[PDB]
Structure 1
């Protein structure tokens, strides 16, 4: 037969049941498929179908082909070529039969696979369950069944949503068409009763839409008659009615995905574009004759048995991710461009280009590049599915659940991304500008220019001059803000005037409550003074020279008064609540004088002004005189109150955004929700990522190399007591730093109420 709607494996080995379409009708049919396998030796043997072969391995090779029955009846049942005899290891043996068929047959295809080779218009059914509320529907019936106000709200909510979605329904009415009755319910026997009644009304010629993100999928297949062809999918009844009326657009989108990807409708998942990318990449890899590292059973890339073992390169590859993000703090009287960036992963994969043993295979990378060029061209021609694919590639290169996931691939892509971000910085600086900040999503650039109204032409020139270089052909360079004047120490602690004044300071959050308003007020005064001085200098014509003189004496008067008030009231139960220093994530250190903490913060912000250090320094002295603190006393030195706890490369799937998020320096809204869209993140997912980071650091401590404490050589041997240069061995990750990391983890867990991470921390000790 010459078109497919579903594959699924029979109970017996090597046999598929298949659902095919011809002459209008769906038909059930059955295919017999061999298991292709590769084996490797460093000696010849050929006792037995077996064939000598050649194909690139992942970083003497024979192809082998059996029906799965005899393979199973030999491999773990008989002394055979599958046992010992210098096998360096099987490779593709994990690929399930239907997952082989989906690659080599597609949709545009008992019956032997040896002779098989490479307008929907039918009925739909529906079963979405919202855990008690198993909900049922047919595209050829007039009532909806729900398991255990109801009727009234259902009828009018249907009418309302139907009115809201008339054209959207009508344009897909022929796929799925509308008013209906309803009924609301040991009770799980009804599900088998309903599904059997459906089968009796339609033995074939109808398609079943299963479930939605509150999944119970496997138990669903237990209650459901397993023999249907099924599209698997992963007073608040508005949700349900909206899904019902969404159905036709879903079928349209799925048909578009299938017709593009050449994948049957039942097998692909809307929930993971990574799987579509997997099957398509697998097709091109085998068509370019690469031995395929597809893994069905585990995340790890199936290199044969060797992926079971620990390896120091592999563990470094898996553990490591952090960009060498640049942060040049200072005051900037120049205009600063807030350059947003996107498509850096896509751009670098496109613009990319043993002796090297953790590089991903150059052949497979070439296939990924050429295939991404193919997808990109089809996105330029507005294949919406191809654009959705290219946007989703950043997930697939990182997602361990991808069938062709490889740690070396993730790392090869990652460090290429790093190198290209540095080359982008090199280009911007080569154009005479200077970089305030840079990471994988953003660059802030000093312009060597003084007014935004002069620069709206020059900025677009600059951005175009970058993107016209071939190295950056595909970047989404976007001037997201214009800063007239910028005070900057990190991306959680800055203020400036934009073209209108904004101020955000994690520094502020660690001051006691009575002084937090005071800090903001003086920040506005400092910005106003810097502005007045900038424009004053520009009317006379580093422009900041003398800006302290517009407010210094008022500031010292104010601080004398506040010091008197603190001596009056810090002890007082009437006022002590506003002098309590807050407990916070990454709360670095203790402090005994909160006014001194405010003054330290204000002086530190002003000491960012590289041109003017002397006037701020003298003002800092005369302020610290108020406390009888010496100018260089360690009590008066500024150390950042926030200890960063960054989770690298966190993914917002709703907009495919790859952000490092800092649980201490970020504001809580930027932790619990995205910062390009504003969808919220799942709490258990987030705790899981923190546990992955915690265990990554414990492992990274335990697997570390030791280093000689005076000549800094690495300890190359297993049983020396000290280095041959007489120096003792010391860790490259000293224990103190790891205790500090665990301390910030316990603080973060206590504050945000992360129960699972807290249990993990507790189970380390106890």
Structure 2
């Protein structure tokens, strides 16, 4: 029984070395692992070439279901296990088994012996030879003697540590058993005071993790760049000890220092560190001191994760949570009869070489990430409940030959059982299982993780959409009206009128929804209660809301107003807008309260425009007169300047016209007092020399939309869309729940990916006839057999407008990568 610290392949094929903890100190052992591949060689009779030393057997493993691969053809799959060296010298010649006729492809040729060892053997390896000397002088073979013992506790750790860092010439070193600090090319006092300060700040953590790492030390700030090798040599011939390295140039520092390859290393890469160009010393002191005094917590977390996941400590990382998913899922599939389709250095599943070819179906299922939503605009006097839904994806996963687009059902059941046991273990006080469940969704989304298949992602997305529509159906079964629907927020209209009377009722819908077996794992929460709502859009609403209904006391009512429409008005009329909107909201609240006092038409709101009609008429007359008098003056031209914003497309002249158009369009959403609003609109338009149904008096959307689907916040595993045009600032650059700033070049890269996907989709579109809407079924034909000529399903003007709005977006903010992408066309 040995606790393995690291697995590492040698420069020889199939030869591996392990830094392992022998019963004494650390020690290194050389291994040998043969290769194993999956082949579809000939139909049923093959040129075996049995003289070559290999083990050949016909198997019946479960192959992946490629959408392009519709013909089973031959089915005599073969498992081939074969030492790597003979594979290398047989790759040289052409007349060999691996390259012959009717070779459909190899399925497990991209799995290194390192990965096979780390999955099948694990960290808890032992021997049952019952030749130890002969096997220790040489490399001991694995495939004949192999078994994994239990790993409940890895080891009782008591051993020194290493610490090498770099901040883009801030190379740093520290020894746990040493007592000196020297930094490569006021500072000493700051270092001492900061060390003491955070010492008292984290006394508790220091005391708890002292048994892992344990104190003041000297300070120094030192041609000079050759000292890394000398220090590494001093440490190497002074101690055997584990290296903690932190730098954005991991491989560069590994290659520059030749001695770093002879000890096990635990890596703590947290890159993207920058200097503020001034007073970098205090912040760098903060960074180094927090890293040093949190190293104990870091190594404790790594020890927990390693001794739970059966993974060596040097192969793990704090952010490499997808690695555990991959390891566990791969080993459970290997215990099954399913090929792993494991892939390396490529974010695509391995299919035997077929995946290299372009295909229409795969490309269509790759870029179809749009999530639809439901929005029923209108004016509501009833109470509305604002709720949020959580853990939707995991509930969807756990809940629920002919179809060529299907994802393998055996893998789906395997992962469903894996997630079920994960949930069961997480319920019984397991933080690791909780974090793993939280990161499962991000593992599903991210193509960077191995064992990733676009078919699985499309399957999960379609299932999520179906589950959401089923939830909408269940909600609408009772007395309800869905106003807004989304992956994160749902607005429900309540049939009642008073918020105080919806306590038990809302609790009853909550309980009934939760008890449904389809929605057993959903988490639902109530955020706000709406007394009076004017809802037309997610970014455009205003009304009176109460946070939570209280007992025996009148609730606190606060008015809110979110309106990007006001941002497109003239600078001098926005005060008029914000005044008159509040006035009309007050009048609406007054008339609803009066109607409730008294007791498709509703009398709660009928008769509200009568309160403010005459003052509005006089105010509009005065505003028109003043605009007429002061529009041509030079010094008054500042306040009449029409603002420009990204996504704007309307060119228009008179601001007062758009002011009154927006004011009337807000009222028009009543859907029950249409005639009164139309009469008032005609009366207002009579002040101008316009008519009731003129084209100039029609309100439109002053802004376009540019939505990016499923942006991921790593700090929350939070998934949401983001609109670059309609949304207000200081929200594009930060998460919705947490206030963490987003990376910018990531935003530009995602925008460019969206643009290129749009262009490709336009390029690969289909053709449709004019009179009949049948699709083109010939590669070359003048026109339809009937009358009419072909037209594209994707109009040119749409993509032209999309590129125009992309240009506007790239011009408003500073996005030089996107501008370079545009200029290359």
Query: How many residue pairs end up in the alignment?
Result: 761
Distance in 2 (CA, whole Å) between partners of 1:473 and 1:214 is 47
Match of 1:9 in 2: 9
Deviation at 1:40, TM superposition (A): 1.5
Distance in 2 (CA, whole Å) between partners of 1:383 and 1:51 is 43
Deviation at 1:23, TM superposition (A): 1.6
Q: Please say if residues 42 and 101 of structure 2, whose CA atoms lie closer than 8 Å, have aligned partners that are also in contact.
A: no
Deviation at 1:702, TM superposition (A): 0.4
Deviations 1:498-529 (A, max 9, x none): 11111111111111222223222222222212
Q: Please say if residues 587 and 611 of structure 2, whose CA atoms lie closer than 8 Å, have aligned partners that are also in contact.
A: yes
Structure 2 vs 1, CA of residues 76 and 705 (structure 1 numbering), >3 Å: closer, same or farther?
A: farther
Distance in 2 (CA, whole Å) between partners of 1:175 and 1:280 is 28
Structure 2 vs 1, CA of residues 430 and 185 (structure 1 numbering), >3 Å: closer, same or farther?
A: farther
Distance in 1 (CA, whole Å) between partners of 2:736 and 2:635 is 40
Match of 2:130 in 1: none
Structure 2 vs 1, CA of residues 628 and 287 (structure 1 numbering), >3 Å: closer, same or farther?
A: farther
After TM superposition, the structure 1 stretch with the greater mean CA deviation from structure 2, 640-649 or 147-156, is 147-156
After TM superposition, the structure 1 stretch with the greater mean CA deviation from structure 2, 725-734 or 510-519, is 510-519
Deviation at 1:460, TM superposition (A): 2.0
SS at match of 1:39: strand
SS at match of 2:80: strand
Q: Which runs of 5+ in 1 are unaligned?
A: none
Deviation at 1:688, TM superposition (A): 0.5
Deviation at 1:2, TM superposition (A): 2.7
Structure 2 vs 1, CA of residues 589 and 84 (structure 1 numbering), >3 Å: closer, same or farther?
A: farther
Deviation at 1:350, TM superposition (A): 0.7
Q: Please say if residues 295 and 301 of structure 1, whose CA atoms lie closer than 8 Å, have aligned partners that are also in contact.
A: yes
Deviations 1:115-149 (A, max 9, x none): 45442332221122221222222222212332222
Distance in 2 (CA, whole Å) between partners of 1:71 and 1:383 is 45
Deviation at 1:249, TM superposition (A): 0.6
Q: Please say if residues 282 and 292 of structure 1, whose CA atoms lie closer than 8 Å, have aligned partners that are also in contact.
A: yes
Structure 2 vs 1, CA of residues 15 and 578 (structure 1 numbering), >3 Å: closer, same or farther?
A: farther
Deviation at 1:26, TM superposition (A): 2.2
Deviations 1:646-697 (A, max 9, x none): 0001101100111110000111222111001110100001111101100010
Match of 2:56 in 1: 50
Distance in 2 (CA, whole Å) between partners of 1:101 and 1:654 is 32
Structure 2 vs 1, CA of residues 46 and 549 (structure 1 numbering), >3 Å: closer, same or farther?
A: same
Q: Please say if residues 19 and 263 of structure 2, whose CA atoms lie closer than 8 Å, have aligned partners that are also in contact.
A: no
Deviations 1:86-109 (A, max 9, x none): 111111111122122111122222
Deviation at 1:429, TM superposition (A): 0.8
Distance in 2 (CA, whole Å) between partners of 1:626 and 1:565 is 14
Greater radius of gyration (CA): 2
Distance in 2 (CA, whole Å) between partners of 1:228 and 1:457 is 65
Distance in 1 (CA, whole Å) between partners of 2:248 and 2:379 is 48
Q: Please say if residues 687 and 757 of structure 1, whose CA atoms lie closer than 8 Å, have aligned partners that are also in contact.
A: yes
Structure 2 vs 1, CA of residues 579 and 115 (structure 1 numbering), >3 Å: closer, same or farther?
A: farther
After TM superposition, the structure 1 stretch with the greater mean CA deviation from structure 2, 327-336 or 454-463, is 454-463
Deviation at 1:754, TM superposition (A): 0.9
Deviation at 1:576, TM superposition (A): 2.0
SS at match of 2:346: coil
Distance in 1 (CA, whole Å) between partners of 2:248 and 2:630 is 56
Of residues 499, 516, 524 in structure 2, which corresponds to 1:452? 499
1:527 aligns with 2:574: no
SS at match of 2:526: strand
Q: Please say if residues 162 and 178 of structure 1, whose CA atoms lie closer than 8 Å, have aligned partners that are also in contact.
A: no
Distance in 2 (CA, whole Å) between partners of 1:398 and 1:326 is 24
Deviation at 1:404, TM superposition (A): 0.9
After TM superposition, the structure 1 stretch with the greater mean CA deviation from structure 2, 480-489 or 740-749, is 480-489
SS at match of 2:35: strand
Q: Please say if residues 530 and 544 of structure 2, whose CA atoms lie closer than 8 Å, have aligned partners that are also in contact.
A: yes
SS at match of 2:2: coil
When normalised by structure 1's length, the TM-score is 0.96
After TM superposition, the structure 1 stretch with the greater mean CA deviation from structure 2, 14-23 or 307-316, is 14-23
Structure 2 vs 1, CA of residues 45 and 462 (structure 1 numbering), >3 Å: closer, same or farther?
A: same
Distance in 2 (CA, whole Å) between partners of 1:196 and 1:139 is 17
Q: Which runs of 5+ in 2 are unaligned?
A: 49-54, 67-76, 126-138, 148-155, 270-282, 547-557
Structure 2 vs 1, CA of residues 237 and 553 (structure 1 numbering), >3 Å: closer, same or farther?
A: farther
SS at match of 1:460: helix
Distance in 2 (CA, whole Å) between partners of 1:427 and 1:383 is 33
Q: Please say if residues 511 and 598 of structure 1, whose CA atoms lie closer than 8 Å, have aligned partners that are also in contact.
A: yes
After TM superposition, the structure 1 stretch with the greater mean CA deviation from structure 2, 5-14 or 587-596, is 587-596
Distance in 1 (CA, whole Å) between partners of 2:717 and 2:188 is 40
Q: Please say if residues 810 and 818 of structure 2, whose CA atoms lie closer than 8 Å, have aligned partners that are also in contact.
A: yes
Structure 2 vs 1, CA of residues 691 and 14 (structure 1 numbering), >3 Å: closer, same or farther?
A: same
Distance in 2 (CA, whole Å) between partners of 1:674 and 1:631 is 45
Structure 2 vs 1, CA of residues 428 and 47 (structure 1 numbering), >3 Å: closer, same or farther?
A: same
Distance in 1 (CA, whole Å) between partners of 2:417 and 2:298 is 30
Distance in 1 (CA, whole Å) between partners of 2:634 and 2:8 is 73
Deviation at 1:438, TM superposition (A): 0.6
Distance in 2 (CA, whole Å) between partners of 1:694 and 1:366 is 37
Q: Please say if residues 95 and 295 of structure 1, whose CA atoms lie closer than 8 Å, have aligned partners that are also in contact.
A: yes
Structure 2 vs 1, CA of residues 528 and 709 (structure 1 numbering), >3 Å: closer, same or farther?
A: same
Distance in 2 (CA, whole Å) between partners of 1:140 and 1:47 is 64
Deviation at 1:331, TM superposition (A): 1.2
Structure 2 vs 1, CA of residues 286 and 551 (structure 1 numbering), >3 Å: closer, same or farther?
A: farther
Distance in 2 (CA, whole Å) between partners of 1:746 and 1:711 is 37
Superposed CA RMSD in Å reads 1.9
Deviation at 1:299, TM superposition (A): 0.5
Q: Please say if residues 191 and 224 of structure 1, whose CA atoms lie closer than 8 Å, have aligned partners that are also in contact.
A: no
Deviations 1:710-745 (A, max 9, x none): 211121221122122222111111111001111111
Structure 2 vs 1, CA of residues 21 and 335 (structure 1 numbering), >3 Å: closer, same or farther?
A: same
Deviations 1:219-277 (A, max 9, x none): 67757622221112224421221111111111111111112221111112212312221
Deviation at 1:76, TM superposition (A): 4.7
After TM superposition, the structure 1 stretch with the greater mean CA deviation from structure 2, 666-675 or 545-554, is 545-554
Q: Please say if residues 254 and 261 of structure 2, whose CA atoms lie closer than 8 Å, have aligned partners that are also in contact.
A: no
Distance in 2 (CA, whole Å) between partners of 1:571 and 1:83 is 83
Structure 2 vs 1, CA of residues 496 and 213 (structure 1 numbering), >3 Å: closer, same or farther?
A: farther
Deviation at 1:591, TM superposition (A): 1.9
Deviations 1:435-455 (A, max 9, x none): 001111111111112122211
* Superposition misfits of 4+ residues, deviation over 4 angstroms: 45-48, 212-224
Structure 2 vs 1, CA of residues 436 and 42 (structure 1 numbering), >3 Å: closer, same or farther?
A: farther
Q: Please say if residues 16 and 32 of structure 1, whose CA atoms lie closer than 8 Å, have aligned partners that are also in contact.
A: yes
Structure 2 vs 1, CA of residues 317 and 147 (structure 1 numbering), >3 Å: closer, same or farther?
A: farther
